[PDB]
Design a protein around this ligand. Structure first.
Ligand code: HEM
Ligand code: HEM
Ligand SMILES: Cc1cc(CCNCc2ccc3c(C)cc(N)nc3c2)ccc1C#N
Ligand SMILES: Cc1cc(CCNCc2ccc3c(C)cc(N)nc3c2)ccc1C#N
Ligand SMILES: C[C@H](O)[C@H](O)[C@H]1CNc2nc(N)[nH]c(=O)c2N1
Ligand SMILES: C[C@H](O)[C@H](O)[C@H]1CNc2nc(N)[nH]c(=O)c2N1
Ligand SMILES: [Zn+2]
Lengths: 412, 411
């Protein structure tokens, strides 16, 4: 079974064979497309061997050693261990390979041209929340690299009986607090109101400002989570200024430099790593379009447009569109001026097209989620808009998991 | 299998029950989503056709509160006998109108479907020649344009009978600008219409030498060779493109036509196939300003506009492209609005569509919708539809694509 995708701007045609190796499901059927559904969706060892064998077959193929004595012994080894312990342990090399390919397989990620250059931190010997805090400080320091950002992931011990999970309760390692005011307004990031309240309940002394960096809330071995303050000197931030508009600085905006997602689940050969924070660097629109201009976030369009003196009572003046562009210019300008790594959506999407084509040629495909790959502004003037993409799920992978405060059994 | 869609900007959740009636396929499977493929992939035998007819008549008679009525049963009986008789059947006027409105209601890629029930249907089933097709099309155009106060319309030519005698409009839209080869190996016109614009000449057109030249109609009646007709220029409403602030904008020489009228699709109702069924509404601003003007495969005026704004074009990070794109789209809206010609901005139209969705979920139990096509090509996430989960599925009656005539026409 072969599959063709077309670029409608360049008429480049590529052929997908990689989708044949696709195990998991999409959520779609031949009678319905769930391509715009945000999230569509305790391991017995009946299920675990095949998943382990498949991963190991992948691994030893990638290293030129399929069918080798080393390949066969490792299979036998892992089988014995699953027989004996109902789970198994990855070698370091397998772990690094798994984590890189999870990224490579991440069909929603436009930054995947960088997948081979992931720094993998093995935190599988960690046992306490304090140890978790230490590992995460080191991740942050390393990844930030004084503004010259480096991709990294830190991998905490895998799930066992599901009653001893390691979880980072933060959705991101660095994020701003949100406070719901009595009058209904929100101070700070509305996306984080719920988590902020938990932290506050857990004993966090909230500064109650508009850009308070949240404390880490860390759960080790299924114990109750504990609060830690990331040392402020480790949190790199950028004041947002505009290159031509001088009043922009007076909006009092800033953002943090390091995007580090910490609530996803890393799956490798059937093993589940429930705490595996990973980080890269920002695409400008993440901050300028979504974080700042989503109505459910900081929502600064009107104030910006107000100070641009735009005609704001006629939507067909496109005053929203006009302000959106200036804000994104300011985000890019600020990061570059402070020499903090950032990529504009034009450069990012162009790179991904080059990546995708390369992946089709050396790998036979590259699973891609159009709905997420196309930037949140300026869609059709980026080349991904005009690119047909096949979406399918490969392992190793990053998966969503439910919020820990919903499932956690509290010890007290 | 009673599905939920969530809006992540408002937490509004809708329950979809309508998808269960879906007939055709999507392109997707368990193992692969083809949601972003532009085009997922001879007449019908006689009880391929009756179940098709029955399904249609059931929903038609259900729609008028007469399901299970003897008038319903009589119509099924009548169509059933007409079917076994003639290897086909003919729609009642009422059925034809219902079918056309619902083909629009069911177009999952269309953002403007809140207007679906106010469609002017022109029955052209008595047409026999390309000259008659031309007459019907001029009347469609004059009616739809309405001196700038645009009105939705569809004109329906005779149904396919078996591929023998297909009626086809060879243009992709009733009104489009010529795109020719040229010197330099450059392109003058609309590059998108290159191939078509000299098939016109390949057939006898002689072209006015410009870029914004309205193409001639190329009409095929009863499977015959297609004929050339020029739409009377006084029927073709065009809008000069100026900017409300930048007065150099006029010098680019930009204009666009008022009437978007798609003419190469196939309308399917109760198994019957209408290969010539041009339909029209009015533009959303971004279709012209973002796609028609700024696509690299189209008029691609970005560089030109940026230069005169004297923007920093040395590298992508200045977002000069983005800045110009917005100004270009402000102008289109401005020009159309000032010439009192109908147009909707992408903010208004997407807001309309959200209201439309809530209407369809409430009164109909769902609204099929293709997120990839509904989200505007600029300013995606500041329109409400970006944050709207949508389910895509195929309902009938429908508008479908069909092969380009010049490939299939036994010449
Ligand atoms: C190095 C620069 C990187 C850039 C510019 C980048 C960019 C992006 C963007 C724009 C998204 C869309 C998500 C959103 O808009 O909220 C995304 C999603 C994603 N990225 Fe990347 N990324 C980078 C690195 C990484 C790394 C290092 C990993 C993992 C090790 C990764 C894994 C993912 C995953 C799993 C998603 C899907 C998130 C979800 O479905 O919720 N990315 N990326
Ligand atoms: C009245 C105002 C209308 C507006 C504002 C509107 C808007 C749009 C837009 C923006 C698209 C996206 C396609 C593209 O970007 O090329 C579209 C597609 C479509 N529209 Fe509507 N439209 C309108 C009227 C109509 C009418 C009257 C019909 C049929 C009677 C119709 C049927 C369709 C169909 C079938 C598509 C999908 C085309 C395809 O799949 O290639 N529309 N429309
Ligand atoms: C369910 C959900 C999911 C998400 C995902 C947002 N984060 C995705 C992501 C994940 C990793 C990234 C990385 C690693 C870098 C980067 N620049 N951006 C990244 C963005 C956002 C909101 C919601 C909600 N509600
Ligand atoms: C296969 C294809 C399809 C399309 C779709 C273009 N037509 C869509 C359409 C169809 C009808 C419309 C109508 C009726 C109004 C309006 N404002 N916009 C409309 C837009 C464009 C390019 C290709 C190609 N190649
Ligand atoms: C409803 C829809 O799936 C949702 O709004 C998606 C659309 N595409 C996206 N794309 C990116 N990169 N990030 C997002 O959060 C979303 N949200
Ligand atoms: C490959 C992709 O499907 C293609 O570029 C689509 C994307 N979305 C679109 N959306 C609209 N409204 N019109 C289009 O032509 C397209 N083109
Ligand atoms: Zn799908």
């Amino acid at each position: 079974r072969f599959l063709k995708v077309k670029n409608w701007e360049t008429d480049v045609v590529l052929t997908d064979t990689l989708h044949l190796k696709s195990t998991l499901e999409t959520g779609c059927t031949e009678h319905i497309c769930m391509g715009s559904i945000m999230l569509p969706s305790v391991r017995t060892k009946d299920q675990l061997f095949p998943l382990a064998k498949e991963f190991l077959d992948q691994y030893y193929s990638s290293i030129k050693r399929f069918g080798s004595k080393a390949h066969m012994d490792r299979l036998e080894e892992v089988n014995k261990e699953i027989e004996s312990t109902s789970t198994y342990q990855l070698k370091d090399t397998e772990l690094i390979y798994g984590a890189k390919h999870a990224w490579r397989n991440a069909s929603r990620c436009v930054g995947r041209i960088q997948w081979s250059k992931l720094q993998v931190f093995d935190a599988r010997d960690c046992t306490t929340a304090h140890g978790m805090f230490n590992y995460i400080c080191n991740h942050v320091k390393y990844a930030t690299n004084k503004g010259n950002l480096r991709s990294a992931i830190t991998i905490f011990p895998q799930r066992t009986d599901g009653k001893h999970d390691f979880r980072v309760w933060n959705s991101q390692l660095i994020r701003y607090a949100g406070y719901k005011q009595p009058d209904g307004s929100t101070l700070g990031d509305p996306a984080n109101v719920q988590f902020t309240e938990i932290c506050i309940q857990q004993g966090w002394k909230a500064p109650r400002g508009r850009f308070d960096v949240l404390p880490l809330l860390l759960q080790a071995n299924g114990n109750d989570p504990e609060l830690f303050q990331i040392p402020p000197e480790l949190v790199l931030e950028v004041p947002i200024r505009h290159p031509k508009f001088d009043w922009f600085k007076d909006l009092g905006l800033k953002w943090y430099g390091l995007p580090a997602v910490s609530n996803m689940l890393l799956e490798i050969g059937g093993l589940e790593f429930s705490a595996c924070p990973f980080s890269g660097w920002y695409m400008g629109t993440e901050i300028g379009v979504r974080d700042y201009c989503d109505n459910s976030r900081y929502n600064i369009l009107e104030e910006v447009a107000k100070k641009m003196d735009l005609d704001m009572r006629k939507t067909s003046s496109l005053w929203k569109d006009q302000a959106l562009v200036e804000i994104n210019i300011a985000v890019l300008y600020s990061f570059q001026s402070d020499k903090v790594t950032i990529v504009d959506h034009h450069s990012a999407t162009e790179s991904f097209i080059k990546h995708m084509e390369n992946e089709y040629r050396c790998r036979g495909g590259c699973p891609a989620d159009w709905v997420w790959i196309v930037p949140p502004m300026s869609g059709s003037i980026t080349p991904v808009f005009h690119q047909e993409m096949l979406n399918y799920r490969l392992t190793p992978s990053f998966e969503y998991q439910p919020d820990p405060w919903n499932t956690h059994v509290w010890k007290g």
